[PDB]
């Protein structure tokens, strides 16, 4: 028995975060291949969101590793399809990514608060180490992208930012 | 308009195959982290199924790329959770992998047959090039693993094969 | 006598594809030096279409090699001059290239269907191997160029796409 | 059970091809050492036919591998001795090699047709990938050798072609 | 005329040895691909017997070379199919290889004795140089393999010896 | 006293062989400088026979070394001048070389037989090791040269073979 | 059972040669450390005979390997102490080594004759390959050493030959 100081509600919270990270990965994968569609044809955004999909899947596997490390049991659920089939302009998609990352951030903060309420000092630090600052940096990056995409405007500016910044 | 000689039924079969490859990726991910659970503790199998999960996800993205190349539209669905939460012995899991890969193979053969019935010569060759021989090779490899896992037996043999062959 | 399983109608189809590939090469050569004219002065497009002209001539020589390999006889015809003397905007020329490549694709698919109706298994696979996927990729690329050229607009955007993408 | 979409008549056809490839290997071995006989003494042809014998044995082993990959059973038969004990002039031998490769080509085309009639998409593609174009190229090469051997004539020409081309 | 001190019964004996070496090569090929069958799945034995098949074919070609060197005439016969279609356990197969190599050894000793009775000093030395010690060493190696296969036992031991020693 | 199991008749046969190897060396030297005469002017043959002369002289010194190793006494005789002053065509000379090498071979076989009749096991193996297979190989090479020189014919062929093969 | 064409008297002869080679090794070891004694102090001879002792032990192990290779049974006997405790002058010791090597040579020739009388063609060639010429060369070398040691004389010459030749 390796389980120690690991509450069953914390364990359920981890399984729930695993699903949410997979959901984000699937959403960024949808975004990536939307921008690869010939009627959209923004290759920098295709690369940017494909990499984001890879990273979210890595986040899910980190949480699965943690579940096993602490002596919990991974329980998987359906990965719901993304909210949209097509994602509009480049700015629209980055705005949707900002909304999603803020939703993931709030879910991570609630998980941290739950672990903390149960005295799980190692879990709290683990969440801080691998997730909380990474989320803050991703959110700041997405916000900057939105401000710049507003600045460059439609048409030539969207092509330029796609190629020079996202790609 | 880039679409040419690409039938709407073939397009729907590609969207179906995308979902099935993702379902396989999720099943192998479940298997991989089952073998990482401390009550199982087979590290070679963890590595082997994690890599299979990566590959199936790559198969899904190849089909997504093909959907776009031919002028179709990707439509994603929920990725159903895997059939089991735990996978038994190493041989049980390899047997479950074999059954899944044969299900995937029949789905690909059916997709090929449909494309062929619509005169889609490029789609048929594409499926042959990227999937049909790869599937034959994976099934032969899984069959051989099952025969060897029967030969080495329970206990020390399972440890040895996990470490010396799968890992 | 090396000729085996090679129908006289297949042979005539190959001679006809040889002429069409040469016609495409001549058309891209016209496009390339139109963009080199001082009243147009788009050097990226000059390079892009010069390379496309080289590749179409390579396609014709592949078919001539195949004709000889199967024991047919090459019969050449006049290479008709291109449909236009000047090609308009950059987007107009890429649209004309998309139309031409789709016409070449349909001609290749008809050639494949003819060979298949005569049981010429090697010819069908040869056409798949060297032409059918290459055509699909060229058509997707041209479509993406058109979507991007629409996005960047007239003037500065056409200069930019010419230099940063086509060149 | 790995066997899937693999018809028993296809399996018997593969076993027949294995014997024919081994028969071809044995014939080229006979040719090779005929040319090593001191009353013949053509060292370039010795090397050329010895290599052809090696390759035909590789073809046999590819088909044995394929038989196992698809879940069939290899059944071997006698390898019949070659049709002749001595092979005449260099041109005579290359002419006999051409006749044999066309016989093997027809056998491969009949095997492909049989597989296609049973809907074995992977087998057809495997035969195309490993044998059909390979066979077209070998027949063209043998045809060209016969034309050149006719051109160079008896005596000095035969010595020269043996040394400068076959060797 | 290069023939010197080369008896016609020696020449017929060399032709007989050529067929026996080719028969041995064919038997080891059968063994090799029996072990590649998915119901057997012993990859080390596949590689070990494939190499033995190559070497026996080299032995055949050495004797063909010798026949030509001495001014004899090579006369080939059918290569009879191997005695079995399947070869049992790894130990069974190595035991059958030992029986075959002892049969080949006795044939070589009878060939040496025949040559010696005709005063063919060079032939006797050639057989000693290329075959007799080579054969003693192969028999000793096969004997040691059988003893070790008995020692390691069924199951895990067979897997281990196949992988660590034969492979 | 080092002499052991070395019969006086074997010793006299070694002294006889020493003289015959020297006679061969002198014959090939004559041939070599015949082909260097300006009325013949075949430089490849000059090089080829000069090297054969060097080798035969090395054979004589090996036998001299062996005479001393076994405790015999070297006794030298006149080296008789070669049978001819001029050697005709390139084929004539190679034919004369073949006859001489077969005479040398019979002399070596007779020497082996004598040693064997005296129980000199080491001398027999020594003759086998240094001479009997070397002689078989030289005779086969000379036979092949004669066959090729017949194939290439007079004039241009003789020039070509001299330069491309002998030189 | 690996034993084939290996007579029980041959086997007994091999066991007997094993003992004789060990006896020679022990004798050269005695010689080597005699010359290392401070009242003798010939360091070149110490090295020379130490190496000879190593080689004779290697000869014994070759014969033990051969016994096992042919399926005999090694049976060891006492290694008798050397005939002398001290070996006189340097020339006296080399004379004793010559006598011993001639005794070993005669024993090897008798072993060869016995094997030959039983038709053991491989054994005869093995003895020739590893022993008979090596013995002839060692005997010639020892004889030369004795002639030179006579030439250089007592005192300074013995010191010089010891250092410049044996060491």
Author numbering:
A (entry chain B), B (entry chain H), C (entry chain B), D (entry chain A), E (entry chain A), F (entry chain H), ...: 3 to 169
What do the authors of the reporting publication say about this deposited model?
Ferritin is the main iron storage protein in most living organisms, playing a key role in iron homeostasis and detoxification. Canonical ferritin is composed of 24 subunits, which self-assemble into a quasi-spherical nanocage with an outer diameter of ~12 nm and an interior diameter of ~8 nm. Thereafter, we introduced a self-assembling strategy by designing π–π stacking interactions at the shared protein interfaces involved in two different kinds of 3D protein nanocage superlattices, which is referred to as key protein interface redesign (KPIR).
Upon analysis of the crystal structure of AfFer, we deemed Pro156 an ideal position for anchoring the His motif, because the side chain of Pro156 located on the exterior of the C4 interface that protrudes on the outside surface of the protein cage. To elucidate the protein assembly behavior at the atomic level, we obtained P156HAfFer flaky crystals and solved its crystal structure at a 2.10 Å resolution. As expected, the P156HAfFer nanocages were arranged in a BCT fashion in the crystals. The designed His motifs of P156HAfFer form four pairs of π–π stacking forces in a face-to-face configuration along at the C4 interfaces, whereas the inherent Pro156 residues in native AfFer stabilize the BCT arrangement through weak van der Waals forces. The crystal structure revealed that the imidazole ring distance of the pairing His–His is 4.01 Å or 3.74 Å.
